[PDB]
Amino acid sequence: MLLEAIFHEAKGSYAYPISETQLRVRLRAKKGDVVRCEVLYADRYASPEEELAHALAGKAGSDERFDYFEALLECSTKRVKYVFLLTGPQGEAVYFGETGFSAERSKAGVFQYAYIHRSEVFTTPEWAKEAVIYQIFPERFANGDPSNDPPGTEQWAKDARPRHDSFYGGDLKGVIDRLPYLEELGVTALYFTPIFASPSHHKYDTADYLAIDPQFGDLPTFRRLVDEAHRRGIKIILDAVFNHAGDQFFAFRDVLQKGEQSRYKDWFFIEDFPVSKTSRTNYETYAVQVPAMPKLRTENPEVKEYLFDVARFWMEQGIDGWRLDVANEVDHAFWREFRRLVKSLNPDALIVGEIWHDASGWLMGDQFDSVMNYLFRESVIRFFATGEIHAERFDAELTRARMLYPEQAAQGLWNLLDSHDTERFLTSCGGNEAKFRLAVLFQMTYLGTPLIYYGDEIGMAGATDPDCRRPMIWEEKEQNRGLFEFYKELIRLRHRLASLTRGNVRSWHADKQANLYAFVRTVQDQHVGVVLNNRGEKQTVLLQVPESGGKTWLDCLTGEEVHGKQGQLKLTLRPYQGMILWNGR
Amino acid sequence: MLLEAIFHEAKGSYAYPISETQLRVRLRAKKGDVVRCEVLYADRYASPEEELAHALAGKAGSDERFDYFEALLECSTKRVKYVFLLTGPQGEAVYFGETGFSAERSKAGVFQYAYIHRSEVFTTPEWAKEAVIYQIFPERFANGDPSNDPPGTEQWAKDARPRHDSFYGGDLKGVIDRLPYLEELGVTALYFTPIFASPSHHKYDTADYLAIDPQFGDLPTFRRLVDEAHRRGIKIILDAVFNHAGDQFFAFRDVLQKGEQSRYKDWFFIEDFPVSKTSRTNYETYAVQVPAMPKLRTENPEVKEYLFDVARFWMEQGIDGWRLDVANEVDHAFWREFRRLVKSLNPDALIVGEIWHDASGWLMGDQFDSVMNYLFRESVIRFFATGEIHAERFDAELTRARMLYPEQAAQGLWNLLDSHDTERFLTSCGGNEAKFRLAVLFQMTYLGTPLIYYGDEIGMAGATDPDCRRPMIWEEKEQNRGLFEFYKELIRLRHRLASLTRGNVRSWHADKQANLYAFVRTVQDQHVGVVLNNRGEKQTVLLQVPESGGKTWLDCLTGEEVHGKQGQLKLTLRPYQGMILWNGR
Ligand SMILES: [Ca+2]
Ligand SMILES: [Ca+2]
Numbered sequence A, B: 001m002l003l004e005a006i007f008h009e010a011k012g013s014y015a016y017p018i019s020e021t022q023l024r025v026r027l028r029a030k031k032g033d034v035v036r037c038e039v040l041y042a043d044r045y046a047s048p049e050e051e052l053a054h055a056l057a058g059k060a061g062s063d064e065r066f067d068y069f070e071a072l073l074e075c076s077t078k079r080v081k082y083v084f085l086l087t088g089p090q091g092e093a094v095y096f097g098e099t100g101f102s103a104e105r106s107k108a109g110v111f112q113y114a115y116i117h118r119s120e121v122f123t124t125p126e127w128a129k130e131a132v133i134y135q136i137f138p139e140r141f142a143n144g145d146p147s148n149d150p151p152g153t154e155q156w157a158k159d160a161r162p163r164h165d166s167f168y169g170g171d172l173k174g175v176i177d178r179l180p181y182l183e184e185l186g187v188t189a190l191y192f193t194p195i196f197a198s199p200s201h202h203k204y205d206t207a208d209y210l211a212i213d214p215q216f217g218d219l220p221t222f223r224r225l226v227d228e229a230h231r232r233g234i235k236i237i238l239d240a241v242f243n244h245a246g247d248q249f250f251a252f253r254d255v256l257q258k259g260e261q262s263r264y265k266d267w268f269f270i271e272d273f274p275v276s277k278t279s280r281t282n283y284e285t286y287a288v289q290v291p292a293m294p295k296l297r298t299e300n301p302e303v304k305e306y307l308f309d310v311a312r313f314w315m316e317q318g319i320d321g322w323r324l325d326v327a328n329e330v331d332h333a334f335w336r337e338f339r340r341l342v343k344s345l346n347p348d349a350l351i352v353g354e355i356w357h358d359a360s361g362w363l364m365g366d367q368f369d370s371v372m373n374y375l376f377r378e379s380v381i382r383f384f385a386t387g388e389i390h391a392e393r394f395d396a397e398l399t400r401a402r403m404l405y406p407e408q409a410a411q412g413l414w415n416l417l418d419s420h421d422t423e424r425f426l427t428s429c430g431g432n433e434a435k436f437r438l439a440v441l442f443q444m445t446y447l448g449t450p451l452i453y454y455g456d457e458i459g460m461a462g463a464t465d466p467d468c469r470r471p472m473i474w475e476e477k478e479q480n481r482g483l484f485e486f487y488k489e490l491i492r493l494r495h496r497l498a499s500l501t502r503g504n505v506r507s508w509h510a511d512k513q514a515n516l517y518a519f520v521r522t523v524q525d526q527h528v529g530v531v532l533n534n535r536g537e538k539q540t541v542l543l544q545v546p547e548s549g550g551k552t553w554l555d556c557l558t559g560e561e562v563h564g565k566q567g568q569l570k571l572t573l574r575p576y577q578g579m580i581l582w583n584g585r
Helices: A172-177 A179-185 A219-230 A250-261 A301-316 A332-345 A374-385 A391-402 A433-443 A481-496 A498-502 B172-177 B179-185 B219-230 B250-261 B301-316 B332-345 B374-385 B391-402 B433-443 B481-496 B498-502
Strands: A015-017 A022-030 A036-042 A053-056 A058-062 A066-074 A080-087 A093-096 A111-113 A133-136 A189-192 A235-240 A321-324 A350-353 A414-416 A449-453 A504-511 A516-523 A526-533 A539-544 A552-555 A561-563 A568-573 A578-582 B015-019 B022-030 B036-042 B053-062 B066-074 B080-087 B093-097 B100-102 B111-113 B133-136 B189-192 B208-212 B235-240 B321-324 B350-353 B414-416 B449-453 B504-511 B516-523 B526-533 B539-544 B552-555 B561-565 B568-573 B578-582
Touching: A015 A111, A022 A036, A022 A080, A036 A066, A053 A066, A058 A391, A058 A504, A172 A179, A172 A219, A179 A481, A219 A235, A235 A350, A301 A332, A321 A332, A332 A350, A374 A391, A374 A414, A374 A433, A391 A504, A391 A516, A433 A481, A433 A526, A433 A578, A449 A481, A481 A498, A498 A516, A498 A526, A504 A526, A504 A539, A516 A539, A526 A539, A526 A568, A561 A568, A568 A578, B015 B111, B022 B036, B022 B053, B022 B080, B036 B066, B053 B391, B053 B504, B172 B179, B172 B219, B179 B481, B208 B219, B208 B301, B219 B235, B235 B301, B235 B350, B301 B332, B332 B350, B374 B391, B374 B414, B374 B433, B391 B504, B391 B516, B433 B481, B433 B526, B433 B578, B449 B481, B481 B498, B498 B516, B498 B526, B504 B526, B504 B539, B516 B539, B526 B539, B526 B568, B568 B578
Parallel strands: A133 A189, A133 A449, A189 A235, A235 A321, A321 A350, A414 A449, B133 B189, B133 B449, B189 B235, B235 B321, B321 B350, B414 B449
Antiparallel strands: A015 A022, A022 A066, A036 A053, A036 A080, A058 A066, A080 A093, A080 A111, A504 A516, A516 A526, A526 A578, A539 A568, A552 A561, A552 A578, B015 B022, B022 B066, B036 B053, B036 B080, B053 B066, B080 B093, B080 B111, B093 B100, B504 B516, B516 B526, B526 B578, B539 B568, B552 B561, B552 B578, B561 B568
16 A cells, blocks of 8 residues: 555644543545555553553545544553554555554554643533524614614615615614524524624724624613523623724724834834825735734734623623634634633633634634634535535535534634625525525535524525625515525424534535535444435435435435335435435434 | 655754754655755745745755755744755655655745744854763862762772772862862863762762762862852752652651652652652652652642742852753653743853653753763664774764754764773773874863763773772873873863854765775864774775865874875875874865
8 A cells, every 4th residue: 555645643633532531533545546554552651561452443534635543442541552564456464653654563663642631632612513594694684773873774675786885774683673683593603704893894803892883782782682582592702803993993093192102002003104005005904905904913912811701791790702814814822811811700611713724823722712613614515505515525624624623613613604805605595495495404404503594594685795785684574484494493303303413424425426415423333324415316325224224214305204224225215305204213 | 766765844853943043954765766856945925926935955965874964044023934855866856745745836835934933043052062971979179188089988099999889088178179170171061970068978968959969078178169160160069869869868858757648749759659669669759760860740830930930049159060960750740840940040140951762852952951861872882892883873863863953952962982881991892092183082082071980081991880980180291191191182172163163064985895994073163083093004085175175284283284185185184193183264
């Protein structure tokens, strides 16, 4: 086999504890290059003559070009050393260790996970493991209070087509008046984009971190919201913009007024004074040349303490976690310490970050709890919506992703289908509900945290920003209640089937030709299989199911009861029809 | 080219800054699969249609199975995204990016280094970059005061053969009196193994972390050592053992007496009560069943603060750094915070850890400065002493290990030939001085910090523990001043050639049959190439040297002048001879 293609490291996403005494190990090799992977391990101080423990590494998945093996090691000593034994299609065996490769186990060496400290066990809030988040764009969700609408606000109508400078008066009061709705839908948390004192429409340039923007409400209204949401079993998530502030931030305006006399001059990155100019900037900002967004020096103790204080103020109000913006642009020390602050105030506080690239460096367990799973969307958009990729490709994109980070993180990734910065997925589906409904079925049954974008649930459509930010449709007769009930049922199923929230993921079937994909979610002895027929034609498939995994399945969506015969399960799926098979365990 | 064998990551040892605006990048590939590696980069926020930067990745070296390419990206924005352009033997062009491989740049995606914060640019003390450490085991170095010799201390003789419980009276005063000797040798720093108050002989079971063991001296004596040593240009590095404490440790004893009602019960890992027993361990300890060494609970804030106070104390005495024992078993959060303390107290304090396996997780820049380079010892023992490997294998082992951690670490790794836990290298060489010297010449010219074990500079030989703890031979008549002088010359040269202390490493030539190896240290324009004739036979070698690096070289050890012609340098080395050719720049 190609040893130069096999990889592993005693850390990161290939070696990490899941418990105080259990070490997980991942090993990858060229697809087809290895057939069996076994792990021999023992305590690091074990006598060189003592016998080693054995652990079989199952094929956890495979992507475009790699094979992935995962095994669980029992380390009662909390210290472990181990070597890999890899067997090829031709029985050729070889040990893989820290030293390298060899036919003799001794010469291969041994990887070592020094010690497993309880504090370094990746731990995330339980309520998040089986949660469903609903993304709220305040300015467009509900106008509960007309008295705070900004001047020039436009009529709230379904036919309205938002313009970049539009206003609709969306506010926190509406979110409250509509809480019965979210509860009915079944969401367990609301994620709000920025809503803090700011002069712009987007509010990404914070002016006052300790205050709700007047057009949205006030502390009183916010406290009311949090309280009314909680008694409804709904957590609250706010957006944290700590990378940069607005040009009206008290600390910045002082520097604009006092130049080097400002006690806050080092709260930013300035090249020379005076500090200011239009189309030109003598201080670092978000992206390139954005005057309204002066970068904050999160490395500075003053800045750090201040934001940490800002977090305390809002955590005092009862929020349940944060969504970090441009998180990847603030120092790690800051994030490490922030989590400590946050987790000590609330062990169940969530920390979700937004990185548009491999976020492993932030997802080891000492910083964020998870991040937005943009990969999920990319694979989902192209699979159900544009159809640029087929089922076998879709399977790969997904798998490659799962093995990207530790399970504690993969399990909590926010899987969104769109956002306030993208065209609505229904539109991406060219308006076809058959395609949209299928995707949502997948979103609601896959590994991670489903993130619902306001309105998608009743079938709102629209191009990218700002057309995706159309005012929420509240007239029941103008809403797609058929769709609305679909989301409800999917959400209800996801709540009862433990496998769907806390189960692993395994690919079941991938037909590049028929474009049908299947996977199974597992927890304990329970198994739930999902079959997706992504084609505008009726198709029939043959899935394999050895009696050991059950002999009869019940389609949780239709009640239909199918039986497997001779280790196979015959299934006929209707156009864009999805099936969710439960084995009753 | 086996694509499944190419590796990279925008973190760790494959992507790291060397300055606030300079990012280093490394790529791994199957040997021979890539002949040209170039990187195309731009600002993370740069427009799509903007001209991409170019940076050629030179081949940094190769090992047993891989090739390694390196590049330095100029990133004025401290923000960068990049894509690799790989060229094979047959001219095939493949792009490599976060998304994967493709003949098209757009489909390859791009790796991203989100942001470069100065607080994250690996930084190590300046004096350690040109330092030459000297390992001292107090008990066997020198007896400056017999009044502290424990009963049973034996005579100080060259032919003395120490037993496990022997006592010679080595003490700090002794070190003081011998400072002139050490200063002459040219060592710039002194490293003491544990020397704190302990009831045992080895002193690994700390009883009083705030006091020097009476057998070595008193606090006032240590102070005398630091000042007198400092004025000779010699630093002091103390060995700290925080993973576990002694069974006589004040905090521990409180539990042995008050049992469960011990105010310090949560400071350790205690299974059940009574708190202890003989030959049987009912509490976690170092290794397996070590009643005198109960593991300290560093995860505990009370312990952390205490160990830190202990740290502050000794740093207030003026020490210059720490050598951590069994550090790989202490939580990272602890070390991260330890560094912050130590460094704030003294930015020049050194933090060297001891971990016998891939320590990348501790060598990112937020924890240790370096570790003992055990891989170096193995490469020198098998190449110089046992002859287990030839010149080509030596080359690989060296190359592979060099590429394990970021350059800032590699440059400051402690390169030891032996220690209080092994036999004298001379013993490993079977008494062959011609071999010992060549290994030392390499040690003195390779990348890393040379570690000299007390006595080795005067040719002390001996078997492993306790024979490696033989009393220092101070009788000049009995000293191999011949070797001693050699040691001196190398140390001098090292201090005069910036490239030997701060330059990189590149293999120059390797021959498995002739057993001849050569490498080049380069810094700015200075080049110094080392040629090793590791064979007991006079050999001639033809090295390739384009006029670019110079056309004339000088052997610093003999003063011989060598000239190159048509890009070749013909050198004749005597049995086991090594040359150090300076390009005069
Ligand atoms: Ca309003
Ligand atoms: Ca003495």
